[PDB]
């Protein structure tokens, strides 16, 4: 059905770009958390080693 298809020729450059952007934002949140966790683990191994 075509009215939706020309709503698809007018707009979803914007909507596809937006979706890509929200995804990349999520993935950057994830990798920043995945660099914060090795920090904590690392301070932990510090505290063990010094106790040795």
């Amino acid at each position: 059905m075509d009215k939706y298809l020309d709503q698809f020729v007018k707009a979803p450059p914007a909507i596809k770009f937006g979706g890509l952007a929200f995804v990349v934002g999520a993935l950057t949140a994830a990798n920043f958390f995945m660099v914060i966790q090795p920090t904590e683990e690392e301070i932990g191994w510090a505290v063990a080693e010094r106790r040795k």
Partner: protein, 452 residues
């Protein structure tokens, strides 16, 4: 409602709108397009009934969509006639914002279901009508039993009555808000009407006919002057005629045409039908549990110069009426009958004598409907009541004017100027003569110019 894809409806500008008697009702803008029709036949697998509609109305319905109605029904504040139509409508719009959040102005159907002859004979029978020029013609409107029954209750209720298997026939009147009236006969179920429920509507449409109706050839100007006179010196008159010959119209015409600004007039009706452009007037309507006699009895009590009784149907009121005539009021009314034994019989059968009616009744007009194929003609077929006779046959009647249908003409039949003399004197009688030969269509304006 259901179609194939919404896109297909919009492209072809067609919309299914119901399914009845194994067929799919399809509203279609281009019913000559066999490609689109055959596409719909193949895709639905259903047999079609085609209904032509304006392109933009179909498009509007496609985008808008018996459901939105199924909910707006449960809104008591809508059906209520006590509420002015101007506001009621607003509620329906705002309430409709529920679905899509706009105001739709003018939902044709949503309004069509909330806010000269129509013959509706039975179930699944196409309605017939009488067109102002075309006469009897068939119509594209049919209702099966369920729709018939629903119409039937609708019309019954708007006319103020309750048709049921206990009371299957109903002879009421619809009051269109435009003050206009219409006679409605109606039957529920099949107990009287084997062919199913049925209704007939003989449309009035009013705002009240005037003496401008010597246009319609009904009464000659000469006779209308004679009546103008007659009504000024308070000669009492009854308009008799078979059903729908014009009794009420003619009556209302005669009162409306006169200047009644200087006289207290005074009307008792079972429902409103009478419109008068006059100030000294008391309009009285039968209410629950009141007889016509209650209102007349108590009304004659004040000082009416003129008394108008919509139509005499309980003759206990008839009796009060002719009593009013004998005190010397100007009384006027309507009666269902076709000639002189018709009325007199009809009048005498709840106990007024012809000395009291015929002796105190002055003039009796007889109205008709004449048809010559498709002309619709309402004419005054004819009557001066002279009095009673001692030792007799009674009712002494001098026929002033007859109507010949063969030439559509009003003839004078042995009336003389010495007859209508009945005047208190010379100057009074002279005034009658002047009005006889010496004496703008709207009622307001016509009254306005008889006033002068």
């Amino acid at each position: 409602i259901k179609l194939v894809p919404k896109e297909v409806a919009e492209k072809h500008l067609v919309v299914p709108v119901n399914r009845a008697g194994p067929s799919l009702i399809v509203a279609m803008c281009d019913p000559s397009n066999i490609f689109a029709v055959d596409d719909l036949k193949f895709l639905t697998g259903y047999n079609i009934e085609t209904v032509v509609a304006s392109e933009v109305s179909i498009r509007e319905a496609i985008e808008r969509y018996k459901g939105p109605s199924l909910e707006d029904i449960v809104g008591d504040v809508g059906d209520d006639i006590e509420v002015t139509k101007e506001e009621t409508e607003n509620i329906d719009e705002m309430a409709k914002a529920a679905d899509d959040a706009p105001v739709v102005k003018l939902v044709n159907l949503i309004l069509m279901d909330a806010i000269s002859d129509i013959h509706v004979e039975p179930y699944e029978k196409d309605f017939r009508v009488r067109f102002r020029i075309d006469g009897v013609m068939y119509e594209v409107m049919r209702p099966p039993m369920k729709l018939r029954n629903a119409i039937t209750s609708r019309l019954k209720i708007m006319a103020s009555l309750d048709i049921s298997e206990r009371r299957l026939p109903q002879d009421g009147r619809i009051k269109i808000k435009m003050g206009g009236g219409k006679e409605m006969d109606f039957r529920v179920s099949v107990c009287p009407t084997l062919f199913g429920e049925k209704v007939v509507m003989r449309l009035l449409d009013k705002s009240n006919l005037q003496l401008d109706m010597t246009k319609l050839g009904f009464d000659a100007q000469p006779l209308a002057w004679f009546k103008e006179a007659i009504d000024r010196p308070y000669g009492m008159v009854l308009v008799t005629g078979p059903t729908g010959s014009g009794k009420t119209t003619t009556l209302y015409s005669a009162l409306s045409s006169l200047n009644g600004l200087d006289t207290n007039i005074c009307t008792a009706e079972d429902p409103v039908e009478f419109n008068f452009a006059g100030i000294n007037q008391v309009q009285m309507h039968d209410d629950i549990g009141l007889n016509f006699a209650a209102a007349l009895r108590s009304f004659l009590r004040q000082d009416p110069d003129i008394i108008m009784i919509g139509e005499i149907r309980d003759f206990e009121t008839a009796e009060i009426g002719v009593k009013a005539a004998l005190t010397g009021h100007l009384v006027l009314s309507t009666l269902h009958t076709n000639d002189a034994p018709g009325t007199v019989s009809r009048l005498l059968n709840m106990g007024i004598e012809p000395f009291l009616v015929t002796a105190s009744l002055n003039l009796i007009l007889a109205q008709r409907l004449a048809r010559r194929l498709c002309p619709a003609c309402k004419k005054p077929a004819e009557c001066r009541d002279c009095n009673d006779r001692g030792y007799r046959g009674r009712v002494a009647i001098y026929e002033v004017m007859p109507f010949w249908d063969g030439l559509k003409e009003l003839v004078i039949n042995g009336a003389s100027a010495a007859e209508l003399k009945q005047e208190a004197i010379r100057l009074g009688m002279s005034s009658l003569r002047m009005s006889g030969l010496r004496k703008a269509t709207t009622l307001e304006e016509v009254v306005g110019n008889t006033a002068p």
